[model samples]
Target chain A: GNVDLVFLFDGSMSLQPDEFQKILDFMKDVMKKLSNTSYQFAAVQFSTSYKTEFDFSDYVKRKDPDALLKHVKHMLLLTNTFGAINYVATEVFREELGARPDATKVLIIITDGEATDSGNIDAAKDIIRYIIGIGKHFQTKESQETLHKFASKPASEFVKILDTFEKLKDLFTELQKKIYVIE
Target chain B: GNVDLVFLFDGSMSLQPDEFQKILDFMKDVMKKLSNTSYQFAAVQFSTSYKTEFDFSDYVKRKDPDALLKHVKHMLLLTNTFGAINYVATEVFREELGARPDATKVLIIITDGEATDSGNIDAAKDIIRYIIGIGKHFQTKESQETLHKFASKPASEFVKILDTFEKLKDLFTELQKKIYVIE
Candidate 1:
């Protein structure tokens, strides 16, 4: 498996949709780095809701660097998390991304502040567990242990699992190989 | 170990303030189904937002089901999942419930529709994984193959999770058992 990145972006009201595009522009660098590898991308649009900006296996394959950049340019931060991303995650990923085979199933939850609904963390855990199962067939115990250690891992291997508020720049720093796993 | 239950209901503006109690009532029936062994309960609410109506740990210690019922009757469902419960579970549960000590942490998400956000099936898998991680501390495993397996078993337990959909009925069931596992 090369790489299967699931970018869960934050498109809350507090965010400027254009600025989200900038974050995507920054992620362009990540795409460039993966240019030589076999990779696919999935997007989870999260605000007050969660939606799949993109799917896992059936995606606009990035054969060229420039085309990938074009797709990136179009990803503006808009919409509530396809109905609070949490519930959507439970339904969508099971149908779309979860069933993908041999993919690295990474969840890049891009949100700005806190959950609009209280106890969101509680619900979020439920969704996360649900999604992981969809990808379980592809994961070995080692991968599961490593991937699930979002909070425990050092800044080097953990990406998008943040504390407190985040901005476009934070997204920039997070994509660097220095921040998350390069392989 | 024993019983594992997850509740999914609606908590939208369409849901009157008292409407949320319908789920509590449904849960009472679930408890009644439980055998002599006590069970754990984790009630998660989803409007446009996802919150834990009750973290799974409190059911075993019934200092008084009366006070608990009062809280259930007074529980509020006063907003729109404005975003989507899918998102609520995504953003918040990642940390809170996922971090709960492992033990069938059944997440019952009460939402109105399939998720106003977008994406389905695929995202549901994530929520499942997230919930399993949250319930990893589950003390009971009913012939376990890991907490994830245990969580999905509850997904299978969804045939008749709700007996009725009204507030008073919810309170009526509250004083009794709503869900449990027999060995």
Candidate 2:
């Protein structure tokens, strides 16, 4: 089955430029392995607001991971995770934007901390969600629980908590494999 | 300014097959005149639910009006106008769905009567709306008022009422010009 995979990145001031670059590099690596016709990728960076780095149509036009993911400038504002999630659920996975009705909808959220703005998680009820929370921000039990709430059921499968941005590369292979196995 | 124009058609059982065909014909005629690079078209038919006849991406692929508007089968369900309106606001006119943030968003609703289900008009708050009502259903003051509330301010320019489907053709040239003059 074809998949519409959208990456929602944390673009708040707390995430340093270098750390954000590392995340992008990790995405480039993961995307390089999944650049087949069956998987279409789109990216949105959210801070106080959201910026669509590329949509599924852009992926269709520029198949290369580097070409599509390059020049993604970060927005150093507040982390409105729920707002971005609502936007993705309502806008990103739509048919007019190259999202096929029959395709599997997958959302991958990369964030460093809890959301500054209160957002309803119910917006993404029908989508398969994967949450990746990194750094000291997610070390707390409360933070980990918050991050887990954003992911799909069976948190062990859809949720990943890492200690640092540098460790993101280590999970690239596993992440790619996980996405491929999605039904 | 480029325009993302979406047509919301009434596809309930009340609208006969021939009437729906006539509406499609009127669309074809209007589209033929506006088939330029500056204009992009998408269509959705709503009854109990909605069906996307074509999206903006599809229009970008099939530029011809006849080709894009052809084979749009009627759903013949209940008229859920408000539900369709909300879908368009949240999904159809989204950036991922080929809706440019900078482009003028125009919604043209062609319906025959009041909504069968209770729908909120507030869903289309930010969009420029045009409402066209045809046949005896809209003859009542209450129905005309309901239709007016769905349209943008100054109903004199944005709303049109006709007694028959055949008269839809008469507004083709005027509608095309109205869309062209949009800022």
Candidate 3:
């Protein structure tokens, strides 16, 4: 695969049941369109903590897109964006977890609000990131700042804020295009 | 190999850093002493959500005992024991996730307090469980009852309580003895 991509999804209590499934369907659509042979993928669902729904290796063993979609159907409390970032950078994005050194490594965080960790995020290294803030929880100034802090250059291209879950279909379609830019 | 043991650990905010490390170290000790060839292990670290630190196949591929111990070194938002149990049973413990139906499956829940999920944990079927309560959080009658509800029959055979982190080593040793009895 030329690209190694991971999605850090919000599994916090803030998301309604319908919205959670909406996120899953959106993921299914994007992954369905992409070429699995050229694109390796993994997903981490984060709330108070982060859980790996499927890693790149899991995809290798079983290349079913439905299996990945089926994994993110649950939720838990709180949003630890900081921990998710750190874990993705230090652990998830590593070779052991499934990253490919030669492929373009990208992290896309689909979160609902500002980080609850409020702890240091410097340990996330310099990994380039794309942030998607969905719904009302991301309206505040603090959230925009946090999103910017975690995203890479030219904030307009890498960071997106959708007003509702219904808008996710449109946003994901846009992200699919952005993902190909790879810069 | 013959025994499939899964540790459901609480990494909620209630645990101090020292205490969290204590739990991880204790796990390392017990697992280190057990023969990997006859006994396979997996772990789920649960707080507001649950994450599989390692699954059975991961150990089989890497053959690294240290890798499992290195996974559980953090505390997150809240206690969601019910959610953890449901996820472990319905998702993590499945064959694709490395579960063995023919082997004896034992779930050992190590947590500090009452479940903050407030959700029903009735979905964890066909798995015998043991619950360990640590610190002041486990002192309340409510917490005790919650632990009792999740454990197998005869509280003495399936439950243990410790007053502090300092007693974890002793508690773990005691639990190891109970593990061998195989009700």
Candidate 4:
């Protein structure tokens, strides 16, 4: 089955340079492990605004994880998690960007804090959203609630909370399994 | 993530010797693919009366699939599928017989025809039942209904219908994936 995986990650100033690097490394590791032409990858780094570091077309040209994400740089601005999700749903997922109409659409959002800008993800209603909230930022009930609301139905399965950026490595195996089993 | 997998299969006269051999081969292949001490295997062939070909304790002693299933002989009699399931739930899965209370219980029932005797699977309520109905015997609505009832809830995922015994090989990958994801 073909899959279009889009990583809509936080690049806010609150996220340290090292933490941002970890996110990129995590994505690269995932791509390397589930390396397949059928599984296309795209990445978006978002703050007050969003940057499409690479789209689906770029992935097809260079399937190597290292080459694909080598030049990805973080944008340290205000967090706009929901805004970026909307951008991915409306623009990044178009066929012109190499998103297959028949492929399974997956959106993985990696954030260190709750959205600073308010928005809804209704545009990406059909996409399977797997939300990963890192650190003490999400310890508050409101922050956890927001993450739950953003994740796909049955948040327990789609949402993952990690204590720190380093713990991201632990989610690789389970996340790969979940992605592989998707329709 | 230990799992106790018990194969309650059809060994009635209706099943040809070659088909019976195929079942054994399928089981052997499954065990070989998922060759882990964490996974314990057991087999029970049933007809008018059920016969425990091997139990979980037997698998612990000899991990070799060929050696364990080498002497298994088909019991050519009436089809009593439900009776065998009841027997497995009652006797075979007992603690003394090597069924671990902490391990996930999986019951794979492979049958060619509907049962000749009436029975319910309420006793094995917690067991995940993956029912495979092979051949034309299950083409009728009644047979299909019986299989649906016997399978755990969400019959679409738990029940599989094959046109012939040979096609059983095709289900190996998907079945292995499903079993692997089980807690």
Clashes of each: 111, 2, 2, 0
* Residue B29 miss distance in model 1 (angstroms): 65
Chain B of model 1: TM-score? 0.47
Worst 10 residues of 3 chain B by lDDT: B174-183
- Candidate 1 lDDT over B51-80, as tens digits, reads 554543444445233344455433234433
What is the Å distance of residue B145 in model 2 from its true position? 73
The C-alpha stretches of model 3 lying farther than 4 A from their native spots are A1-183, B175-183
DockQ of each: 0.01, 0.01, 0.01, 0.04
Residue-wise C-alpha lDDT for candidate 4, range A65-150, written one tens digit per residue:
88877887777889887788899998899999999999888889999998887757788889988899998998876778788867
What tens digits encode model 3's per-residue C-alpha lDDT throughout B1-183?
A: 266778899899978888888878777766765533356778889998878899977766665667766656575789888889888888777777676778767788898878886756677756778888999987776668778878887887788888888898886555443322010
Q: What would the per-residue lDDT of candidate 2 be over residues A79-155, giving only the tens digit for each residue?
A: 88888999998888888887879877888899887899884879787888998999999888888988776789899
TM-score of model number 4: 0.53
Predicted candidate 4 versus true structure: per-residue lDDT over B20-116, tens digit per residue: 8888888887776555436688989888898888899998888888998888878888988777888998989977988888887889899898889
Report fnat for all candidates as fractions from 0 to 1.
Answer: 0.00, 0.00, 0.00, 0.00
List model 2 lDDT by residue over B1-183, tens digit each: 566889998988888889999888887765655554366888888889988888888888787767876777788878888888888888788777777788877898999988877757797877889889999898887788887777888988778898999899777644432221110
Candidates sorted by lDDT, best first: 4, 2, 3, 1
Q: Place model 1 in a CAPRI quality band.
A: incorrect
lDDT at A139, model 1: 38
Listed for every candidate in order, the interface RMSD values in angstroms are 24.9, 22.1, 25.1, 8.2
